[model samples]
Target: GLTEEQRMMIRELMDAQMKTFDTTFSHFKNFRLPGVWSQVRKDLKVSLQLRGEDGSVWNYKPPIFSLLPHMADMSTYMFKGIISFAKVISYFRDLPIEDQISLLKGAAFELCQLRFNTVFNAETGTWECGRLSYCLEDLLEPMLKFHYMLKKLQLHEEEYVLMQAISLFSPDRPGVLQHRVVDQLQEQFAITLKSYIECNRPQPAHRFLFLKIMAMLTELRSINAQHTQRLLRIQDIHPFATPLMQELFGISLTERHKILHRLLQE
Candidate 1:
């Protein structure tokens, strides 16, 4: 048996090896959602033509409205936000170009939902995109339910970015040619999210927090399908749907605008 002093020294050595483990993974440690969103907003050169309030503090717009151009405009902003958000992950560029596009094709609208949720104000029922506060209408009010839950959960910035990265690196996204590498990335981010919840959450019920957050992704998935249907309906409501919208959410992969190529452009 080792002497107590020698045993203590050996344990210390082990800790030294482990000391920098978290440091290396710290690249996924955080994203300034607002910082990146602000960058995207600036690049998009936001030009809002939204109208006035409905006099209720909890609800903003009298509400389609003005829904087509304004709604379409924000989707474009969120699209850029998704690109910049995905670009920051350290390994994003390492993936082959085709797989990158596949991942975004699967994840774009879901991620757009995630990005927009960050700015959604549950109490006010609006998205506070820096200056303008935009409200939801009948088509998307179901998402307000999600916004409320996310606000109540109060996910940290690191958590949000990890969730975004996990969603973005999906291996099963249709046409992802290299499944293992992409799945590896997704797995790492996912484990980190669980680690984050374990190390950070103090609530006793936090036991289930990881499960809840993952389930929220399931919620986002259904919302994705429903919104796809709604967007189909929307193109009929407004003739001039932006190309990016059609590309990002439209049914056919062959019809894509190849927007994922711009993931690194920011």
Candidate 2:
């Protein structure tokens, strides 16, 4: 356990870094819808677009069956944020390139779910997947089940931020050059999170709360893999990949801008 002052310092550092985390991912929060598009688009379209009260153009768009561009956009955004953050961490920067990519490939989507939870509108039971709105009804049953669990847990911003850091510090990633160092990094976040919860929450057996939230990572991974397979199938039917998808999947980027331009024109 860290000394009192050490705990204080960790808390302060986490608070400061969390501010950066929020700002770095702020663009994602914009692309989200407050409610599911399938059920509410008809009700929201005219009002969401035409009303002076509702200002964003995306609010009027209906959810589409084809969603690779949007999903890829999210994955790309998250990948960029991960790279930007990892560059500052000496432990991550010192790793071999293959190890770095391996860690990222293993954990990126799991971390993105933390971002999803941050902006998730529980009142409407909706998830913001890029520009589209998805009702709890349309997604996997575990997604809605997780929502109920999160609601009961009542996770705060500090906890959410810590979870993001923990996700990046994953030590079990295949091909890691310094597994012990990665383990230490993950433990640092865990200790910091434990101290924060003890100081702030202090009641209702908070350590269990942390464990409960940590357990969600497994659920998220399962849900994400299911969704990824579904999206890959959708991507197969499309003639051209979105630029972001091309970059993520290592597809040819040549002529991608032209493809996107042509799609936009149509």
Candidate 3:
């Protein structure tokens, strides 16, 4: 778009990056720098505290501008929210079932990639501002180790839920998995809800309407027979059910039924 000047500037930067080490678009693409962000944030906060003479944490007099190419820029720290959320959304949507064994593993990997690219391509050599023994790639090693520890604990919550469900509904055959039905139900529910959220981000009225509609579709009115019948009709998706069900239903984020919240917290 520009008269070769802007493109030349980019070429110069890329060449500078390449001269230090291998610098290609693929190197930036495959870079997993996102994981180091959380650590960097925590470490910088500590450094600010350590530098304070009267134990007043916030560093007020940090230089606003510097001509040095490899100096750390403190201003860019707060803007990580978008990239972090991108990785989070990617974890659910991008990876296949076998890859999604742990929530943190995928999230951490994507984060590390972003971090590596920033240091290698964007910032150059001013990554560690203070006393730090390791680089982003090195930090990933221990992050993976900690990830397994956290993931195992998370898996136990699933196990606990499965065991409780098994105890509640004893199977006729040895290999019969009762919770498999609920798992499938959860799959459908997740897809439905996730789609609703994504599609309704611009239309609050439509989102509200859909939530109310879902409540009528999903909820049991009461514990009695009449209410049970209403619920059964809701499940069957009856025709006459429309007005009455819509009137009676109210969607909420409340824990009306604390069925799987324990598993959710995991």
Candidate 4:
């Protein structure tokens, strides 16, 4: 039992520890080290760069190899993010098939939103993914806050790439098959963040800079939990009427029932 304010802090700390230990409290092949992290960073930098190198390249959209059944034009840009994300991701070398699918299903939508931020026009509060324009909508009033906050920071390519992987490697995502490596990759990838920032800013504002970017994910996650309700609301009264979003997110961001990512393999 705790006060409301203290409880929220405790809950966040609880979330962090639980996500780590649940996967980490496991059988171990010991007699090894986690290895120097920079090499992993170098490897992922390739993965991240291929997606959006300049941080402002509108000329070439990622090629669509294929898409899931009932996927809509509305969901196409999101899928484009998926296709390219699948294209690189060498960091995924050791993960299992189910883990890939689980990470794909869990992170694609959130990553899509981040990818869209590259095209997010802060003044108008709109996302331009090709010629098509999608706004998170006023239902996204809170989401808009995050969108603007991220763009305002004017993140680097390294930052964007790292964040996407961070989102992808969340070990806590439901149905994640191997928590140890998932968290391991995510943890190593995370070390690059403050290191990169610290070098960039030279130990000045990097403290605020680092937390701002990290909290960027925290806020998006809270907003994502709510997005599911809004996703339901969109169809109930209005009509988002697309199975792809529901399929990727599950009916409630909780359960899993399909093998859609296998399509991406072939």
Candidate 5:
């Protein structure tokens, strides 16, 4: 049972944290889409070696940059970012190892979706991925649906960070030990976001903002599912793809079935 003063103090601390989070990714705030894509292209570009039976080895470079390897970069970046963010949160660090792992496993992809959306061009309804521009034709219906839902919402930097935190600190994550603590932290983030929003723009009519954001989160989860399925399908065709991509997106058979069921329902 935390006191009001303690909760208020926690809120202020989180307020500062929210600001810090904004500053950390400030580059994305006004980054040009093409420039961002160029950065991604550089980061993901790598060479491989092919050995022949004639005792000769040749360097192998992909003819066309594949989305699969770039996705691996995306996963690694998001995974590291999430881990760094989690390390700074006292509540997350204080949790039992089992709890931490459980919460991370449950929420990693959701948080990654938030990061992915940062680069999403809602105005053009396109996703700029490392020398590739993904649109309806390139990504099909799932990407379009994701873009549609996101474009409808006007989210600020704080809101995006708050959404990521909210998804990360979810109490409903399977095997979470300190569920109450997780829920309390998540509530604090939401409260802080609401206060910030109200202070910045006094509008009672915009009460649905949180609900809309939650809907977007749900839509992101589906987008994640679609992306994972796409990667898996690509792996079937290109068996020599990066193992890290599979490692990051790998889920249990039960979880796979669950995601498939959810996707079918939509």
Candidate 6:
């Protein structure tokens, strides 16, 4: 038997190894949804090709072989927020830095956890797959079930590199970051996101709810400018919510925490 010191050292090594593996796995696992979406779209397109060609070797490229185009088109009618983000960026790319930042912040907060609506369209007789949050990754198909199985297997080095790239560094002094972002938004966007929530969202006026929410997000940029302010709870939304919000709000890192927390608690 090993000595007590040896045993303790061995256990510490094992724990460290496991934690590294878990964090590594999480990085890749998070992308499962997007990757699986790409795969299924390919498979379905291939299946259609097979049907059209009657299993004959035609060496033909699939008809609709793009993911971004499809995701964009589907998301437009499915979710207004996704469309808004794309539109805002495209329209305001050349705008003033403050304007760009404000718009970006709003877009980010709104798009976080944005899901595709998948309701069946009765008129088309085909399911509106794009708007549906039921991404193929969550399907019960035997091929898809393996998505989890793949994660159960450890990641390769190349995969780990991608995950590391996704790692966002946390900073010191979170609250001060929030205050700076708020100040920026007030100066540039002239809106207070937290105040908007307190004054408007609690009792939403339907005709203006969308506009109000978006304006609040613009204010969020100033609040998120601090490096440490980005950490906040985001609940009642998709896992993709925080990233989407950050992209739009242009929060340095501070205002982000409140946006995330609001997403989580309220």
The residue-by-residue lDDT of candidate 6 on 46-140, one tens digit each, is: 21111222444322233332333333333233223332332332122333333333333433322321111112222332222322222221125
Residue range 130-240, candidate 3, lDDT tens digits: 222122221133323233322322222222222212221222212223435434433443444434344534565344543432332222111122332433443343222
Count of clashes in candidate 3? 14
**Model 3 TM-score, 2 decimals:** 0.17
Predicted candidate 1 versus true structure: per-residue lDDT over 1-266, tens digit per residue: 33464334334323432332221122221211121133322221112222334543322334132445656665665666566555544466677766766777688788777666777667666666543556544323556677777777788756666667778887877688889898877786677678767777886978898888888887877777777766666565445457677666653333355554554444
Q: Score candidate 5 by TM-score against the native.
A: 0.60
Q: What is each predicted model's overall lDDT from 0 to 1?
A: 0.60, 0.57, 0.27, 0.57, 0.57, 0.29
Residues 163-223 of candidate 5: C-alpha lDDT, one tens digit per residue: 8777878898666778898999888877766665665554776667777777777777666
Better of 5 and 6 by TM-score: 5
Question: lDDT, candidate 6, residue 171?
Answer: 14
- Sort by lDDT, best first: 1, 2, 5, 4, 6, 3
Looking at model 5, report the run of 10 residues with the lowest lDDT sum: 27-36
User: Cα RMSD for candidate 4?
Assistant: 16.7
Which ranges of candidate 6 are over 4 A from the true structure? 1-30, 33-91, 109-231, 234-266
Prediction 4 global C-alpha lDDT: 0.57
In model 2, which regions exceed 4 Å deviation? Answer: 1-65, 127-140, 205-207, 237-266
> Of the candidates shown, which would achieve the greatest TM-score relative to the real structure?
1
Candidate 3 structure lDDT: 0.27
Off by over 4 Å in 5: 1-66, 128-140, 222-266
How badly does each model clash, as a count of residue pairs? 1, 0, 14, 0, 0, 34
lDDT of 4 by residue, 1-266 (tens): 33463334334333332332212212211212112233322211001111133465322222211222212443543554454455345556356767776787677767767766777778765565443344333323666678888999988766776677688789988789789989987776666666667667757545688788888988877777776555554444434434556566564222252435534454
Compose the digit string of candidate 2's lDDT tens values, residues 110-176. 6666666765667777654444455443333666677667666778776776776677778886456
Model 1, residue 242: displacement in angstroms?
1.6
For candidate 2, the per-residue lDDT at 211 reads: 76
